[PDB]
Amino acid sequence: QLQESGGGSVQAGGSLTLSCTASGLLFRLASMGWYRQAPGKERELIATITVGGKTNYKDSVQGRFIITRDNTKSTVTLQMNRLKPEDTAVYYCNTASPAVGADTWGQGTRVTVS
Amino acid sequence: TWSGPGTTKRFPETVLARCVKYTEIHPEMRHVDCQSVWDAFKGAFISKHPCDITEEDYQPLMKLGTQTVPCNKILLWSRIKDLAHQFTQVQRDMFTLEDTLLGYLADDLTWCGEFDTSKINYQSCPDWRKDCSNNPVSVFWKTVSRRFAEAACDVVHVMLDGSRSKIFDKDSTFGSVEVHNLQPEKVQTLEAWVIHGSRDLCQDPTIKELESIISKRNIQFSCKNIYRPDKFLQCVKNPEDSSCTSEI
């Protein structure tokens, strides 16, 4: 249902682009988002996108990250520029809707910024 | 006299009008002759004892109401009819049983005849429990439900009522007829949407029962929580409202 890719290791200042394919009707109907979890921390929502492509970003990534979507599958992409060590985490894509659960989770994709 | 309510007032005119209206709202079914549909419907139960109705009695009607729905766009439901219908009013490529011609004609109606006259019984009709199970209404819903479930393919979705004592009820129409007529291979997955009335209700014992039933038919099971069903409907209609998106 959720498959993430595009992670890896990059130097501070560099760029990565993450991809997620979400399979299911509820993904097609819901706002989606990218989340991340640093090793000993709470999973945080960092970027959201409506079905039609209206975006919102956490202040800590505003101006550096771009979320896009192509639409029963939705693909959700996270372009990450000028990466900082603080961005080191496992990244996950899921629904970001008050109406529908982020029930299950993919394996995520690991990003390491040195 | 029976234990159940009598036939719906103006039943003949109601069926005829519903048939005409259906063929107006759904132009793809304008080839049907609504007078012929009514004649076939009536033929299934008139001049017959209403505890001896068979699926065969409804065959002429089933043939006349034949409707090929896109098999991958079927929404089943159990104990939450109103929300499922509201969903297909906004997600118009999907169909519940009562969005098909035959389901639309009969929804919320009651009917029966009697063995010794050609009269419709407006006084009372058999109750499934108290009187008899093979009554005109119950046999109609068993027949059409079986056929609708048989025609589904790919991923089939079902809305279940999360506020009930049994979220999945094996004795419901969904649990006793629909689920047992989903065909393996044809149907890859049954995905349940549990409608809340904020725990994960996909761990409910009755959901685990449904999963077992489905897996025994060699079909995959998926379960989701719809935490806010009215908001869900709003966002299906217009996903661009900011209340459709979780706060950062």
Side-chain angles (χ1 to χ4, degrees):
Chain A
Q1 289 184 0
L2 286 169
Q3 193 168 254
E4 296 106 341
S5 64
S9 298
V10 295
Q11 309 306 299
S15 301
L16 278 177
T17 301
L18 312 183
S19 305
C20 172
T21 307
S23 314
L25 182 52
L26 288 182
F27 297 118
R28 273 286 282 113
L29 301 168
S31 296
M32 296 290 288
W34 278 94
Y35 299 74
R36 75 189 176 178
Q37 189 166 27
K41 303 286 160 185
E42 285 208 64
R43 194 159 304 185
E44 63 181 346
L45 182 50
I46 62 161
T48 62
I49 186 157
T50 68
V51 173
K54 292 178 180 58
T55 61
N56 191 32
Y57 301 92
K58 193 153 177 140
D59 63 350
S60 58
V61 307
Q62 184 88 64
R64 300 193 296 120
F65 290 13
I66 305 97
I67 187 172
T68 60
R69 173 175 194 157
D70 186 86
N71 299 327
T72 50
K73 281 190 159 152
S74 290
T75 52
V76 191
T77 302
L78 192 66
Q79 300 161 243
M80 300 187 292
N81 292 306
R82 300 186 288 99
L83 278 161
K84 292 161 173 169
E86 68 160 303
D87 298 312
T88 295
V90 185
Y91 287 70
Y92 296 94
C93 131
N94 219 319
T95 56
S97 169
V100 303
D103 276 284
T104 53
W105 294 86
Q107 219 60 17
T109 189
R110 186 150 76 274
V111 173
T112 301
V113 185
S114 63
Chain B
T1 301
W2 303 109
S3 304
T7 299
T8 304
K9 305 323 288 210
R10 288 177 60 82
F11 182 70
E13 292 79 21
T14 304
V15 172
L16 286 165
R18 286 187 172 187
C19 186
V20 171
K21 184 72 178 311
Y22 189 90
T23 62
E24 292 174 356
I25 292 164
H26 293 272
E28 70 273 17
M29 291 291 284
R30 278 172 193 179
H31 70 268
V32 307
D33 178 327
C34 289
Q35 226 176 260
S36 295
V37 169
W38 169 235
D39 293 347
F41 201 149
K42 196 162 56 159
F45 73 94
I46 280 289
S47 302
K48 288 160 60 60
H49 192 56
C51 292
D52 292 279
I53 310 300
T54 68
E55 298 198 30
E56 307 92 90
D57 291 328
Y58 282 112
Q59 227 60 60
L61 180 59
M62 293 305 102
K63 294 208 192 195
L64 291 180
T66 293
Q67 186 168 5
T68 58
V69 61
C71 65
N72 62 326
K73 298 279 176 75
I74 283 158
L75 182 63
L76 303 180
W77 57 265
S78 191
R79 309 280 199 258
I80 189 105
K81 188 167 67 173
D82 293 349
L83 197 79
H85 293 171
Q86 285 176 262
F87 181 81
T88 60
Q89 287 305 117
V90 296
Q91 188 67 22
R92 290 194 135 280
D93 61 331
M94 296 188 74
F95 289 89
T96 69
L97 178 57
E98 305 77 23
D99 299 301
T100 70
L101 171 63
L102 291 180
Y104 183 96
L105 296 177
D107 192 24
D108 299 315
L109 306 184
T110 302
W111 63 94
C112 63
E114 62 202 16
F115 83 94
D116 58 341
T117 73
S118 63
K119 293 193 279 183
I120 288 178
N121 194 333
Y122 294 99
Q123 175 174 45
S124 71
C125 289
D127 177 76
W128 152 279
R129 273 113 98 189
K130 298 152 181 267
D131 297 319
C132 61
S133 55
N134 296 328
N135 67 76
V137 169
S138 303
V139 171
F140 172 85
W141 290 110
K142 196 168 146 59
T143 312
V144 296
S145 300
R146 183 179 51 73
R147 285 167 147 266
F148 190 67
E150 283 172 351
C153 77
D154 294 345
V155 179
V156 180
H157 298 86
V158 57
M159 292 189 158
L160 304 176
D161 187 354
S163 66
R164 302 290 177 145
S165 68
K166 294 195 286 178
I167 296 172
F168 170 67
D169 187 0
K170 72 271 196 297
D171 299 321
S172 68
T173 300
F174 172 70
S176 61
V177 177
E178 298 168 39
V179 80
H180 300 296
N181 283 285
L182 294 174
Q183 300 308 316
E185 284 187 73
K186 197 175 176 167
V187 174
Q188 266 257 303
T189 306
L190 177 72
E191 174 166 292
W193 297 350
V194 179
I195 309 306
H196 291 236
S198 78
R199 305 158 301 178
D200 177 13
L201 301 179
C202 293
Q203 310 315 314
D204 187 79
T206 67
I207 295 297
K208 287 166 173 167
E209 189 194 354
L210 177 55
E211 184 183 60
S212 170
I213 287 160
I214 281 296
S215 59
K216 257 184 255 286
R217 295 190 65 71
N218 306 313
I219 291 166
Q220 302 184 37
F221 186 64
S222 190
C223 181
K224 313 284 165 190
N225 293 280
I226 309 295
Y227 291 107
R228 295 185 55 195
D230 199 76
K231 183 59 62 183
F232 177 56
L233 294 174
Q234 288 174 26
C235 298
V236 174
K237 195 170 187 294
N238 181 13
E240 305 310 307
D241 190 353
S242 50
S243 77
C244 298
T245 302
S246 296
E247 191 80 347
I248 307 179

